[PDB]
Scaffold this active site. Structure first.
Site, PDB file in Angstrom:
ATOM      1  N   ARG A 289       0.070   9.302   0.669  1.00 53.99           N
ATOM      2  CA  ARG A 289      -0.738   9.392   1.903  1.00 53.99           C
ATOM      3  C   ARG A 289      -0.257   8.476   3.039  1.00 53.99           C
ATOM      4  O   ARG A 289      -0.616   8.686   4.188  1.00 53.99           O
ATOM      5  CB  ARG A 289      -2.221   9.138   1.625  1.00 53.99           C
ATOM      6  CG  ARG A 289      -2.564   7.690   1.342  1.00 53.99           C
ATOM      7  CD  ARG A 289      -4.012   7.526   0.916  1.00 53.99           C
ATOM      8  NE  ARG A 289      -4.202   6.225   0.277  1.00 53.99           N
ATOM      9  CZ  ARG A 289      -3.818   5.914  -0.965  1.00 53.99           C
ATOM     10  NH1 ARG A 289      -3.211   6.810  -1.744  1.00 53.99           N
ATOM     11  NH2 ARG A 289      -4.040   4.687  -1.439  1.00 53.99           N
ATOM     12  N   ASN A 290       0.525   7.455   2.707  1.00 51.43           N
ATOM     13  CA  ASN A 290       1.105   6.553   3.692  1.00 51.43           C
ATOM     14  C   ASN A 290       2.609   6.738   3.913  1.00 51.43           C
ATOM     15  O   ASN A 290       3.258   5.847   4.433  1.00 51.43           O
ATOM     16  CB  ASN A 290       0.781   5.114   3.296  1.00 51.43           C
ATOM     17  CG  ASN A 290      -0.707   4.841   3.273  1.00 51.43           C
ATOM     18  OD1 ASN A 290      -1.488   5.409   4.060  1.00 51.43           O
ATOM     19  ND2 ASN A 290      -1.115   3.968   2.369  1.00 51.43           N
TER      20      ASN A 290
ATOM     21  N   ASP B  89       0.833  -1.223   0.000  1.00 51.89           N
ATOM     22  CA  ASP B  89       0.000   0.000   0.000  1.00 51.89           C
ATOM     23  C   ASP B  89       0.866   1.271   0.000  1.00 51.89           C
ATOM     24  O   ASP B  89       0.599   2.226   0.722  1.00 51.89           O
ATOM     25  CB  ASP B  89      -0.995   0.020   1.190  1.00 51.89           C
ATOM     26  CG  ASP B  89      -2.130   1.052   1.015  1.00 51.89           C
ATOM     27  OD1 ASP B  89      -2.389   1.504  -0.122  1.00 51.89           O
ATOM     28  OD2 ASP B  89      -2.771   1.415   2.021  1.00 51.89           O
TER      29      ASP B  89
ATOM     30  N   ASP C  75       2.113   2.914   7.445  1.00 49.14           N
ATOM     31  CA  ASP C  75       0.763   2.422   7.111  1.00 49.14           C
ATOM     32  C   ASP C  75       0.783   1.176   6.225  1.00 49.14           C
ATOM     33  O   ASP C  75       0.144   1.125   5.188  1.00 49.14           O
ATOM     34  CB  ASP C  75      -0.090   3.552   6.479  1.00 49.14           C
ATOM     35  CG  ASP C  75      -1.117   4.125   7.434  1.00 49.14           C
ATOM     36  OD1 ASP C  75      -1.764   3.334   8.145  1.00 49.14           O
ATOM     37  OD2 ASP C  75      -1.307   5.366   7.440  1.00 49.14           O
TER      38      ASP C  75
HETATM   39  C1  LIG Z   1       2.964   1.040  10.821  1.00 53.01           C
HETATM   40  C2  LIG Z   1       1.528   0.602  10.930  1.00 53.01           C
HETATM   41  C3  LIG Z   1       1.263  -0.756  11.091  1.00 53.01           C
HETATM   42  C4  LIG Z   1      -0.035  -1.242  11.214  1.00 53.01           C
HETATM   43  C5  LIG Z   1      -0.270  -2.699  11.338  1.00 53.01           C
HETATM   44  C6  LIG Z   1      -0.998  -3.505  10.416  1.00 53.01           C
HETATM   45  C7  LIG Z   1      -1.735  -3.105   9.180  1.00 53.01           C
HETATM   46  N1  LIG Z   1      -0.977  -4.766  10.795  1.00 53.01           N
HETATM   47  N2  LIG Z   1      -0.231  -4.792  11.932  1.00 53.01           N
HETATM   48  C8  LIG Z   1      -0.011  -6.056  12.619  1.00 53.01           C
HETATM   49  C9  LIG Z   1       0.217  -3.550  12.270  1.00 53.01           C
HETATM   50  C10 LIG Z   1       1.014  -3.325  13.429  1.00 53.01           C
HETATM   51  N3  LIG Z   1       1.658  -3.173  14.362  1.00 53.01           N
HETATM   52  C11 LIG Z   1      -1.097  -0.354  11.138  1.00 53.01           C
HETATM   53  C12 LIG Z   1      -0.866   1.000  10.979  1.00 53.01           C
HETATM   54  C13 LIG Z   1       0.440   1.492  10.887  1.00 53.01           C
HETATM   55  C14 LIG Z   1       0.614   2.933  10.679  1.00 53.01           C
HETATM   56  N4  LIG Z   1       1.645   3.543  10.200  1.00 53.01           N
HETATM   57  N5  LIG Z   1       1.312   4.898  10.144  1.00 53.01           N
HETATM   58  C15 LIG Z   1       0.084   4.986  10.566  1.00 53.01           C
HETATM   59  N6  LIG Z   1      -0.709   6.054  10.705  1.00 53.01           N
HETATM   60  C16 LIG Z   1      -1.975   5.998  11.430  1.00 53.01           C
HETATM   61  C17 LIG Z   1      -0.311   7.350  10.163  1.00 53.01           C
HETATM   62  C18 LIG Z   1       0.149   8.345  11.198  1.00 53.01           C
HETATM   63  C19 LIG Z   1       1.354   8.102  12.002  1.00 53.01           C
HETATM   64  C20 LIG Z   1       1.765   8.990  12.951  1.00 53.01           C
HETATM   65  C21 LIG Z   1       1.007  10.175  13.168  1.00 53.01           C
HETATM   66  N7  LIG Z   1       1.180  11.195  14.009  1.00 53.01           N
HETATM   67  C22 LIG Z   1       0.125  12.055  13.768  1.00 53.01           C
HETATM   68  C23 LIG Z   1      -0.683  11.580  12.793  1.00 53.01           C
HETATM   69  N8  LIG Z   1      -0.131  10.376  12.395  1.00 53.01           N
HETATM   70  C24 LIG Z   1      -0.554   9.472  11.434  1.00 53.01           C
HETATM   71  O1  LIG Z   1      -0.443   3.782  10.909  1.00 53.01           O
END
Ligand SMILES: Cc1cc(-c2c(C)nn(C)c2C#N)ccc1-c1nnc(N(C)Cc2ccc3nccn3c2)o1
Ligand SMILES: [Cl-]
Ligand SMILES: [Cl-]
Ligand SMILES: [Cl-]
Ligand SMILES: [Cl-]
Length: 273
Positions: free
Chosen positions: A157-158, A153, A171
């Site tokens: 945006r990620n 993905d 993400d």
């Molecule tokens: C890395 C990551 C991993 C996983 C995930 C999944 C799909 N499966 N497993 C097992 C995991 C785990 N652990 C889910 C989400 C993320 C993630 N990465 N970025 C984000 N955001 C929500 C963006 C963000 C970050 C930081 C931030 N600060 C202000 C606003 N922000 C916004 O989410």
């Protein structure tokens, strides 16, 4: 063995106690769940500002924790540092899992690009800087690819912006980012991730345009089938378009690796005065 022992190590490291976490306001709330601001109390006493992503059975929880354990292990400046996970339970007996991340005040790269075209947002981003974002993403993906991890993905945006304007990929897994063979065979390699990276590069060169203007999502497979690709942004270097174009070659095996792309990008960046 070494494989099971290595996995069990990572599982201990990744879980955070719920009482070390304080959940705050909702920053975003889609179909997948919610992103909320939070405080994480650290080993050294002090609290840290975090982002908390809230994501249905016991089998899926293990899979989640195991996956989270792999991601926690990543360690690179252009890959988001997963701080750990918490599992809360709902009143209805549905386990609510929570991903704890460093708080990124500058937000995602896509929004930041769009904001850069608004008076009150950050000053017009020069090509030198735009290219530096691409190098940063390449670096993070290069790392991930070396560890045979697939993002699934990749898009602007990620990718998140740290306080020093370093970009990290985040993400981990939108038809217009998906490579031709993944639309077809439902199969996904690192070369699929490279395709998405090409698209992501084009987002940054256009300062946040949606890919393939004039083409509806259902039209996408046939559009690519007949050999059309994303068009060269105006005032984008031919050499830079050459690089991003190579990411969308029909045969996955003709596409360059992230390490090759990353190096091509750095050379180009050096050449700019
Ligand atoms: C890395 C990551 C991993 C996983 C995930 C999944 C799909 N499966 N497993 C097992 C995991 C785990 N652990 C889910 C989400 C993320 C993630 N990465 N970025 C984000 N955001 C929500 C963006 C963000 C970050 C930081 C931030 N600060 C202000 C606003 N922000 C916004 O989410
Ligand atoms: Cl980070
Ligand atoms: Cl930061
Ligand atoms: Cl736009
Ligand atoms: Cl286009």
């Amino acid at each position: 063995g070494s494989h099971m022992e290595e996995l069990q190590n990572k599982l201990e490291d990744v879980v955070i106690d719920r009482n070390l976490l304080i959940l705050g306001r909702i920053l975003g709330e889609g179909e997948f769940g919610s992103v909320m601001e939070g405080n994480l109390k650290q080993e050294d006493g002090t609290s840290l500002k975090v982002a908390v992503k809230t994501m249905s059975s016991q089998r899926e929880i293990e899979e989640f924790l195991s996956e989270a354990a792999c991601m926690k292990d990543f360690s690179h400046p252009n890959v988001i540092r997963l701080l750990g996970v918490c599992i809360e339970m709902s009143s209805q007996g549905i386990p609510k899992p929570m991903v704890i991340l460093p708080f990124m005040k500058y937000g995602d790269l896509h929004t930041y690009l769009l904001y850069s075209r608004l008076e009150t947002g950050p000053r017009h981003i020069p090509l030198q800087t735009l290219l530096r974002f691409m190098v940063d993403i390449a670096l993070g993906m290069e790392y991930l690819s070396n560890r045979n991890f697939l993002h699934r993905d990749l898009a602007a945006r990620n990718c998140m912006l740290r306080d020093d304007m370093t970009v990290c990929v985040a993400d981990f897994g939108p038809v217009k980012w998906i490579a031709i063979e993944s639309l077809a065979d439902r199969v996904y390699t690192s070369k699929s991730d490279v395709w998405a990276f090409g698209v992501t590069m084009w987002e940054i060169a256009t300062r946040g345009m949606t890919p393939y203007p004039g083409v509806q999502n259902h039209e996408m497979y046939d559009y690519l089938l007949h050999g059309h690709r994303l068009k060269q942004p105006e005032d984008c270097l031919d050499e830079l378009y050459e690089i991003m174009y190579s990411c969308w070659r029909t045969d996955p095996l003709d596409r360059p690796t992230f390490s090759v792309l990353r190096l091509q990008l750095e050379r180009l960046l050096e050449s700019l005065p």
